[PDB]
Every structure is written in C-alpha cells, then in structure tokens.
Design a protein around this nucleic acid. Sequence first.
DNA 1: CTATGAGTCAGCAATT
DNA 2: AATTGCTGACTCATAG
Lengths: 63, 90
Amino acid sequence: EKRRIRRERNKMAAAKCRNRRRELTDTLQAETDQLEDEKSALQTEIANLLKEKEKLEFILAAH
Amino acid sequence: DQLVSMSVRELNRHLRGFTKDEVIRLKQKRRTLKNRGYAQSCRYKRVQQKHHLENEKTQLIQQVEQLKQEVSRLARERDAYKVKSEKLAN
DNA sequence: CTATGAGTCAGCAATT
DNA sequence: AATTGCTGACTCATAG
C-alpha cells in the first residue's frame, strides 16, 4: 500500500518527465528556427545596406 | 549476445534437443535482450539529436552576432554618406 | 520528496 | 506467421 502509492506517484513523475523532455526539444528546435529567421533577415539587410551605400557614394562622387 | 546476434536459422540449429516450453522461453529471452538494445538505441539517438541542436544553436548565435556587427558598420557608413548629402542640400 | 536512467513490456508497422 | 525495430508507458533503483 505504501508500495502502491509510491508507484502511483512515480508513474505521474515519469509522465511529467517524458512531457518535459518533449517540450524542451520543441523549445530548442523553435529557438534554432528563430535564429535562422534572424540570420536570414540580417543577410538581406546586409545586401540592401551595401546597395544603398553604393548608390549614395556614386551620387556624391558623380556630382 | 550470441542469443541476440544469431539468425533465426542458425539459432534453431542449436535448439535441437530443446523442449517446446523451453524453446518458447528461450525465444522470449532473445526478444527481451533485443528490446533492451532497441531501447538503448532509441534513447541514444535522442541525446545525439539534443546535442546536435544545442550545437547548431551555439553556432547560429555566433553567426548572427557577427552579421549584426556587419549591419551596424554598414549602416554607419551609409549614414555618413547621407549627412554629407543632406549638408550639400543645405 | 520528485526527477531521472535504464530495463521491461504493450502494441504498431515493416520485414522475412 | 513469425520476427523485427521502434517508441510510449510502467517500474525499480537511485540521483538530486
């Protein structure tokens, strides 16, 4: 009976343990996805900044 | 080990003088031993996937931080051209 | 105490 | 069919 109760509680603890492991993987995968979004946005921003910078430089130099 | 690694055919080759209850029992033990290894692979694959993601993240954070420094540098340079073009309009 | 590691079986889907 | 591989859940031992 102190056997039965420790089992019930441990079973609940295993369930929570599995759920928590799954959530932490989901959360890590999402973080990784977020960083790839951010990296990709930064590469686009770099290409625009280069384009914007040279447009202005050439205007100033031509005039 | 040999009970797990042997093919069904070579296994029977050794189950010649065994009873039927005994063969059932021995085959259950092979299943149990094989399951023991399946569980170990399963769990090993998960830790390796965790590690691979943790690593990917570490690296991405590094790449992102160096892209942000390139962006700031470049936005400064662009803005230094803009002030001398706003100063000429003045 | 609960959280976790690891062995076991339940049960599904693929293979032989 | 029987066997295999996988993964979710339950259990015991023990880490935290």
